[PDB]
């Protein structure tokens, strides 16, 4: 089974497009799903090898039951709202995700235009974010973002469904959340205080040693081990976005994993906390305004519709 391009090389541009399927739009969506790989080749090929254009298509739980009959991916459910004592992870509507990445925005935009042209009158846009790589892989908080992502075989094993759900092997689960940052509040902190929020040095990106890394730092709370002692990993490709006029400075979070259980465990630790941590300190400067969960099927599943 051939996975979608979940494990993309590093790209500096992205479009995240989240849509709902209007009543009666199911047939139009099915036809487009069977063509998206063709469209990705048509738009991207003339910019190879440096274009690196890819589209990962995800289908939400409710949408799956409208589009398909028979067996479902084992972990496919609607995003689970988290009502923490301070912070809330909201669930927002989303039937289809198109995670479009490239070395240039122009390739992303052209593929988004071709996809949305085919879906006109069948879908309603819910979210559209144009993301950009910010200096040396930094996010809007000024920290390097992606450092401890798994690579190679480790990444394949973390993100791709295998024999635990054999009918859907080569798929993945994507969790998206659009975050807005309170940059005025963040910039009121010293660099040393910001490093205690994230759990790494700001300029050099060296992890704080275990003796000084706070229990409520981002890195501490999103570090999770399984019962068998192994690290539970996700693959992230967070993208900055914003609008200076509106004072909107955001991180578009996207995390891929073999099972939503790994991503949801991290979210629970962030929003509801643990024994030693009320919540992830990153949320004191970051508000989630969307939250959706998608299954990204194997490429051959989409081709065969
Ligand atoms: C709120 C906006 C977010 C920002 C700005 C952000 C930023 C960062 C930064 C700067 C790092 C350290 C460098 C790195 O390894 O990437 C990091 C690590 C991480 N983040 Fe986030 N993050 C956010 C949300 C989330 C969410 C929602 C999750 C999970 C559901 C998550 C999971 C992780 C994980 C697993 C790591 C690696 C921890 C480790 O193993 O060392 N992040 N993030
Ligand atoms: Mg402000």
In terms of DSSP bridges, do strands 224-225 and 231-232 run parallel, antiparallel, or are they unpaired?
A: antiparallel
Question: Which residue pairs, CB below 8 angstroms and at least 24 apart, start in 71-77?
Answer: 71/167, 73/161, 73/165, 73/168, 73/171, 73/173, 73/295, 73/297, 74/164, 74/165, 74/168, 74/259, 75/165, 75/173, 75/259, 75/260, 75/261, 75/295, 76/173, 76/260, 76/293, 76/295, 77/260, 77/293
The whole-angstrom separation of Cα 199 and Cα 278 is 16
Cα 120–chain centre separation: 25
- Can 145 be counted among the known catalytic residues? yes
- Residues lining ligand 1, judged by CB closer than 6 Å? 139, 141, 143-148, 177, 179, 198, 200, 218-219, 222-223, 234, 236, 238, 251, 253, 255, 263, 266-267, 282, 286
Q: Using the atom order of ligand 1, give the atom closest to the CA of residue 234.
A: 35
Q: Which helix (H) or strand (E) holds 21?
A: strand 13-21
- Residue 172's SS3 state is strand
Method: X-ray
Neighbours of 262 (CB within 10 A): 21
Cα 130–chain centre separation: 14
Tokens of 133: 């790589």
Residue with tokens 């309603």: 124
Alpha helices in 47-123 (DSSP H): 61-67, 105-119
Number of domains in the chain: 1
Ligand nearest the Cα of residue 271 is 1
How many angstroms separate the Cα of 258 from the Cα of each of 17, 74, 278?
A: 22, 11, 28
Ligand 1 midpoint to CA 266 (Å): 10
Task: Please enumerate in sequence order all residues whose Cβ is within 8 A of that of 37, keeping only pairs 6 or more positions apart, or say none.
Answer: 299, 302, 303
How many angstroms separate the Cα of 196 from the Cα of each of 141, 193, 236, 279?
A: 13, 5, 21, 14
DSSP assignments along 206-220, one per residue? PBPPTTTS-TTSHHH
Neighbours of 239 (CB within 10 A): 27
Q: For the chain, how many residues are written? A: 305
The whole-angstrom separation of Cα 282 and Cα 200 is 13
DSSP assignments along 188-248, one per residue? TS-HHHHHHHHTB-TTT-PBPPTTTS-TTSHHHHT-EE-TTSPEE--EE--EEEEETTTTE
The whole-angstrom separation of Cα 28 and Cα 23 is 11
Ligand 2 midpoint to CA 182 (Å): 6
| Residues 250, 186 contacting (CB under 8 angstroms) | no
Domain residue limits at 109 = 1-305
Give 144's Cβ-side CA count (13 Å radius): 14
- Residue 71's SS3 state is coil
| Residues 253, 236 contacting (CB under 8 angstroms) | yes
Q: What is the DSSP letter of 142?
A: S
End-to-end Cα, the chain, rounded Å: 15
């Amino acid at each position: 089974p051939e996975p979608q391009m979940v494990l993309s090389p590093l790209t500096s541009a992205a479009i995240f497009l989240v849509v709902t399927i209007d009543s009666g739009g199911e047939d139009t969506v099915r036809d487009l799903l069977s063509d998206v790989a063709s469209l990705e080749r048509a738009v991207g090929f003339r910019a190879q090898p440096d274009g690196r254009l890819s589209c990962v298509t995800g289908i939400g739980s409710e949408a799956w039951d409208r589009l398909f009959s028979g067996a479902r991916p084992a972990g496919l459910h609607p995003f689970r709202e988290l009502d923490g004592p301070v912070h809330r992870a909201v669930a927002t509507p989303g039937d289809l995700l198109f995670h479009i990445r490239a070395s240039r925005l122009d390739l992303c935009f052209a593929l988004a235009t071709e996809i949305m042209g085919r879906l006109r009158g069948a879908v309603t846009p819910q979210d559209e974010v144009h993301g950009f790589k910010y200096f040396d892989e930094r996010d809007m908080l000024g920290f390097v973002d992606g450092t401890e992502n798994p690579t190679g075989a480790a990444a394949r094993r973390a993100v791709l469904v295998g024999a635990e759900d054999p009918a859907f092997a080569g798929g993945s689960y994507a969790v998206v959340q659009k975050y807005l940052h309170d940059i005025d509040a963040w910039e009121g902190l010293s660099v040393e205080a910001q490093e205690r929020v994230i759990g790494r040095r700001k300029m050099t990106d060296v992890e704080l040693s275990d003796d000084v890394k706070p229990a409520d730092s981002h890195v501490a709370l999103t570090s999770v081990t399984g019962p068998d002692g192994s690290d539970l990993e996700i693959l992230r490709d967070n993208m900055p976005f914003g609008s200076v006029g509106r004072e909107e400075f955001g991180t578009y979070f996207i995390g891929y994993a073999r099972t939503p259980e790994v991503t949801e465990t991290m979210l629970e630790r962030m929003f509801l906390g643990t024994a030693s941590a009320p919540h992830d300190r990153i949320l004191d400067f970051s508000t989630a305004v969307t939250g959706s969960l998608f299954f990204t099927p194997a490429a051959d599943f989409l081709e065969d519709l």
